[PDB]
Each structure stands twice: as C-alpha cells, then as structure tokens.
C-alpha cells in the first residue's frame, strides 16, 4: 500500500456496532407505517485490543555509533508527547521507523 504498512489479502475484519433502536409509544390504533418515534439513546463501554508483534532482531558489526531517535536535551516550555497546561495532549513531530543502518 502506498501510504505504507502491511498489505493484507485478508485484513483484520472490521467491526460494526449499533444501539438497538427502542421505539417510543406506538399509537393505540394499528397503522401500517413503521414507527418513526424513537427513544434518544447512546451507549458507552471499554474496548481492548492486543496485537502480538514479531520483531526481527538486529545483528550488525558496524564499528561507529548508529543514529538514534532521542528527545531534545535543551529546556522547553512544556514536555513533548505529553499534556500541556490545558490538558491537551500534543504530539510535536512525526517519528520515522528508519534509523538503524544496514548494507544495501
């Protein structure tokens, strides 16, 4: 896939979820039409997901140090990747997956 990530011929199956509609008072006298009056409703809950990954371990004889992803050592007004005064979580920058080096 162009955006990246693993193309799958049978991806993780998507999940669809809906409240069961609960109709308001139907009339006393029967009528053909479907019930257009519903009880306003919404639900909540906790959803959990694990994804078990396989890591390809790295064995490399390169002498000098690699490049590593490291946080800024200099003082800052607020910590990156963490909440600010308002309670607003802010990811400052994108994080690539390529740092370690290998021989073409």
């Amino acid at each position: 896939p162009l955006m990246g990530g693993f193309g799958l011929k049978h991806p993780p199956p998507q999940i669809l979820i809906k409240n069961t509609p609960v109709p308001a008072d139907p009339p006393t006298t029967f009528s053909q039409a479907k019930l257009a009056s519903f009880i306003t409703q919404y639900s909540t809950g906790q959803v959990s997901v694990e994804i078990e990954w396989e890591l390809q371990k790295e064995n490399s004889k390169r002498w000098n140090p690699e490049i590593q992803y490291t946080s800024n050592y200099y003082k800052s007004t607020n910590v990156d990747f963490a909440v600010n005064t308002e309670g607003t979580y802010s990811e400052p920058r994108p994080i690539g997956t390529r740092y370690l080096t290998r021989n073409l």
Binding site: S60, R62, W63, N64, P65, E66, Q68
Partner: peptide
C-alpha cells in the same frame, strides 16, 4: 572491551 557501537 567495547566497540563504540557495542557501548551504545
């Protein structure tokens, strides 16, 4: 005993 990589 440690190459600058192995010390990293």
């Amino acid at each position: 005993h440690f190459s600058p990589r192995d010390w990293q």
